[PDB]
Design a protein around this ligand. Structure first.
Ligand SMILES: [Mg+2]
Ligand SMILES: [Zn+2]
Lengths: 55, 143, 49, 137, 100, 344
RNA sequence: UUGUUAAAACAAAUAAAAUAAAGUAUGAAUUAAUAUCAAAAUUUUAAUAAAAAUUAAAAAA
RNA sequence: AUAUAUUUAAUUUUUAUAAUUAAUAAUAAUUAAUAUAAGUACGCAAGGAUUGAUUAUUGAAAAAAGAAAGAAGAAUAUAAUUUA
């Protein structure tokens, strides 16, 4: 009973929210005021400065 | 056809565990215990588990016409101080009849008094062995 | 008719960059949980209330 | 979209428009400088006797916009001390308790000596609703 | 907490639970002076932005707070590892004179 | 109730003197047609009927002469004005509480009740709302658990700003009758409820996540079957229907808990109006901190809750006297216990 | 729970608690006539008819 | 004793706020026995009434608007129990 699926049935998955939020989504980032690197808020660096104070 | 089991309603999903701090809940528990004490449904007690464990107790259950009296040995005390929780584990034997009761304090139709805060762990062990032997004999006769 | 729409196309030649605007200062549900969260073991010399 | 669903989806704005048109007649009065609330005729025919010869009472209640505004603005008076102190009764006492004992008859087993003011078992069982004249409990 | 207690039963329990009795002794020697002036939350966890490659799992750096006030470790740099993993850790130039 | 056809509303079935409208003044006779041609050939236009006149006159005389004997017949005129509490029309808004804890109490007969204590931190009438101004379509929103401004979301802090009421954590709406209003910002004291009162509560039970079909329905989940197909009771012919699809409502595994659960008609046990606590002898399923909503039970066993035999409510809402100070008043003094009741 | 022995032990078997068995990367094979495939009910035509007709309206992941 | 389609059970993550509209009569045919109803009509006697309330299951029924890559815990049930 299984059969080959037309290209339209292969593109139905991208209409759901599960596909959009998993693969194609951007990040909210800024520059680490102590490392000058892109950093997400919540995750810090190994350096002594970034551990004592959270940049 | 279709129904929904979960509700993301704000009024239902919001919680107050952060604001529970402004409620003196332990003070409310102590106030309820003190009200029970002043009414006479219970009497304050301050003993430890090993001290009370193994002390004889007499409990009278008020009942018209004749209140039923029962003398047993305290097997376990659930609380060391007085509270609305309470809990005592007594073991009493009649003529060829053993029984293990869990007396809660504060019942007006139930007056239980331990004859002495001091207890004898030897008598406690004797009562425990008697109860375990009776229970094992009952189970063996059943199965 | 639709023959006019068929013969005449409409296009966006070069849309501006899709770079997201600064959204750190807006409301964010994932960062909302950390506003009242105890973070004592997160700092050593610079504890702030 | 079912038949009833489509019918209601297309008629509900029309129902609201009809209600707006109805209230436009009321607003006609306040427009002329004479603001007058709607008047309803009080019906005195609401106590009936049915086919089976028992009492029926219709309930008609009206709403006063001025009283609504007054309750919105002014705070209610102080609650009564006895009202908030005396607790509400748990069990509903029967309409006619059967005492089964009266001290007036010399011989209590004498069925003819019991006073008439004591209700009977038939009333004790059947009287579960108020009497014909009195409507409320 | 066990080190602040400093009881013989507490030391026996820690020696039971730990692999190295030498580390047991090191802890019981250094931690009282280190955390005399603290109540709770002695350790400190910092979530690193870099994740492990094989599992894409987040990493956390857990270290004791009072490093430079009183401890055998003092004035050491943890921003980068030493030249070799068997060499002593980096030391800040400010406190190079201290000895272990 | 007793069936009463509208066609049985003639004057021969009315218990009181039937009064015809007759324009502005009520009359005892049908409106005679102003146009004489409209008179039907057999319609007997009555202007004066001695029977009805004598009956109505004697009725009015007796009503005006013996008020004590005919007190119950006074409801035929001068009805109760609008605004006063009514036994069958006046419903009041409830409150929003927080499930505080659980304990156990005992009544004087000896029955043990495992009770739960709810806490009502700050009940304040926040809003009024009616949709397009229809009948019975008005409700009162009550807010609870005052919070700072940095707590709520911006779009809800904006509403609290627009309302002017102090910003509350939660807000629940109760549908009421217009004569039970309370001005915006009214503090609701817990004594709004009575100890011998039946209450309906609504909350959210705890969440268990995805659970098996056995754990969801207990023993019921193992056997689920329903056949609406026709089957031959007697071997006379052959005919039946095949149950092609699965009927909706089939009991399977899925989300368990985390739903809006409502208990109907639980009696209050005790009330503490110093710490704003209410005790209910029913163990709930929700967690600690779930914002429950309490409302008044309409009626039980065909009997209204608020009546003269049981008691009168604090309509519209309980307001404490001026000289009362809950700070000076002790905790043990603020205890109201319900009358005893046995359930076995 | 059952069965065996003796005046508690052994063997079976399931239904509650507990333990594990990834949300990471690597990645086949059965199958494949097909319209972005016809949610359902009624009636009917040469055997399940998913073939036809009549009501009805069946969202997406 | 093979991973399929229709159909079902759920979910799409704080939405301040239920449902005047799909559940087209009813969650029991608006019940309903029961001590007390009654050592009582009816029956020579023996025996034996209609009956509806408190004891019970009787509220019958669907909570669809806000900025989303940590554990929705900074985790030993405290929104930081003092903290260098
Ligand atoms: Mg959301
Ligand atoms: Zn950095």
């Amino acid at each position: 009973p299984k059969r080959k699926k037309n290209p339209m049935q292969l593109r139905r998955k991208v209409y759901g929210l599960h596909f959009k939020e998993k693969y194609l989504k951007m990040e909210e980032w800024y520059y680490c005021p102590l490392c000058a690197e892109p950093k997400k808020p919540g995750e810090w660096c190994r350096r002594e400065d970034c551990r004592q104070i959270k940049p | 056809g279709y129904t929904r089991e979960r509700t993301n309603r704000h009024f239902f999903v919001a919680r107050a565990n952060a604001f529970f701090s402004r409620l003196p809940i332990a003070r409310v528990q102590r106030s309820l215990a003190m009200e029970a004490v002043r009414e006479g449904r219970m009497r304050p007690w301050k003993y430890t588990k090993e001290q009370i464990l193994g002390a004889p107790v007499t409990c009278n259950f008020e009942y018209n016409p004749r209140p039923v009296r029962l003398i047993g040995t305290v097997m376990d005390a659930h609380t060391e101080e007085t509270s609305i929780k309470g809990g005592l584990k007594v073991y009493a034997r009649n003529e060829e009849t053993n029984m293990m009761l869990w007396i809660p304090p504060g019942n007006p139709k139930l007056r239980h008094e331990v004859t002495s805060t001091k207890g004898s762990f030897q008598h406690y062990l004797d009562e425990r062995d008697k109860w375990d032997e009776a229970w094992i004999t009952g189970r063996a006769r059943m199965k | 008719s639709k023959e006019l729409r068929l013969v005449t196309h409409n296009v966006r030649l070069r849309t501006p960059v899709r770079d997201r605007k600064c959204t750190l200062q807006y409301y964010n549900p994932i960062r909302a949980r950390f506003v009242y969260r105890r973070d004592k073991p997160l700092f050593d010399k610079y504890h702030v209330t | 979209d079912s038949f009833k669903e489509h019918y209601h989806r297309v008629h509900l704005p029309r129902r609201l428009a009809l209600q707006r048109y109805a209230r436009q007649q009321s607003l006609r009065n306040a427009a002329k400088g004479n603001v007058k609330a709607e008047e309803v005729p009080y019906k005195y025919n609401r106590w009936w006797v049915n086919e089976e010869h028992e009492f029926v009472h219709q309930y008609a209640f009206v709403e006063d916009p001025e009283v609504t505004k007054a309750k919105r603005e002014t705070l209610p008076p102080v609650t009564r001390e006895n009202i908030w102190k005396e607790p509400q009764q748990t069990f509903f006492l029967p309409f006619a308790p059967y005492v089964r004992v009266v001290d007036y008859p010399k011989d209590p087993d004498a069925k003819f000596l019991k006073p008439v003011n004591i209700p009977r078992w038939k009333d004790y069982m059947q009287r579960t609703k108020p009497v014909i004249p009195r409507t409320w409990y | 907490e066990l080190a602040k207690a400093g009881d013989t039963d507490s030391r026996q329990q820690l020696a039971y639970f730990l692999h190295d009795p030498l580390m047991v002794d090191k802890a019981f020697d250094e931690y009282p002076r280190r955390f005399k002036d603290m109540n709770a939350k002695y350790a400190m966890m910092t979530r690193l932005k870099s994740r492990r490659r094989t599992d894409a799992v987040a990493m956390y750096f857990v270290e004791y707070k009072n490093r430079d006030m009183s401890d055998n470790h003092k004035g050491e740099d943890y921003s980068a590892g030493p030249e070799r993993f068997f060499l002593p850790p980096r030391i800040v130039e400010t406190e190079k004179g201290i000895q272990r | 109730p007793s069936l009463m056809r509208e066609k049985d509303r003639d004057m021969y079935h009315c218990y009181y003197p039937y009064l015809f409208d007759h324009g502005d003044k009520m009359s005892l006779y049908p409106k005679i047609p102003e146009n004489p041609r409209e008179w039907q050939p057999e319609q007997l236009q009555t202007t004066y009927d001695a029977i009805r006149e004598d009956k109505y006159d004697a009725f009015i005389r007796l009503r005006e002469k013996f008020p004590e004997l005919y007190q119950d017949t006074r409801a035929w005129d001068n009805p109760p004005p609008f605004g006063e509490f009514n036994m069958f029309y006046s419903v009041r808004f409830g409150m929003v509480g927080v499930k505080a804890f659980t304990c156990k109490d005992y009544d004087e007969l000896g029955n043990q009740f495992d009770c739960t204590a709810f806490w009502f931190p700050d009940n304040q009438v926040v809003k009024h709302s009616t949709r397009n101004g229809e009948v019975g379509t008005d409700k009162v929103y009550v807010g609870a658990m005052n919070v700072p401004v940095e707590f709520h979301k911006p779009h809800v802090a904006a509403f609290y700003k627009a309302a002017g009421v102090p910003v509350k954590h939660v807000c629940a709406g109760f549908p009421i009758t217009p004569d039970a209003y309370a001005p915006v910002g009214t503090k609701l004291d817990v004594r709004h409820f009575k100890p011998g009162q039946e209450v309906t509560i609504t909350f959210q039970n705890t969440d268990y996540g995805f659970r098996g079909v056995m754990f969801r329905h207990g023993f019921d989940g193992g056997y689920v079957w329903l056949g609406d197909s026709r089957w031959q009771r007697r071997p006379g012919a052959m005919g039946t229907e095949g149950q092609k699809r699965i009927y909706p409502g089939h009991r399977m595994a899925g989300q368990t808990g985390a739903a809006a659960e409502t208990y109907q008609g639980v009696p209050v046990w005790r009330i503490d109006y110093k710490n704003s606590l209410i005790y209910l002898p029913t163990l709930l399923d929700a967690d600690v901190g779930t914002y429950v909503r309490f409302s008044d039970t309409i009626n039980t066993k065909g009997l209204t809750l608020w009546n003269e035999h049981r008691g009168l409510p604090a309509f519209p809402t309980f307001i404490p006297p001026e000289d009362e100070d809950l700070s000076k008043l002790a905790t043990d003094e603020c205890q109201l216990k319900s009358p005893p009741l046995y359930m076995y």
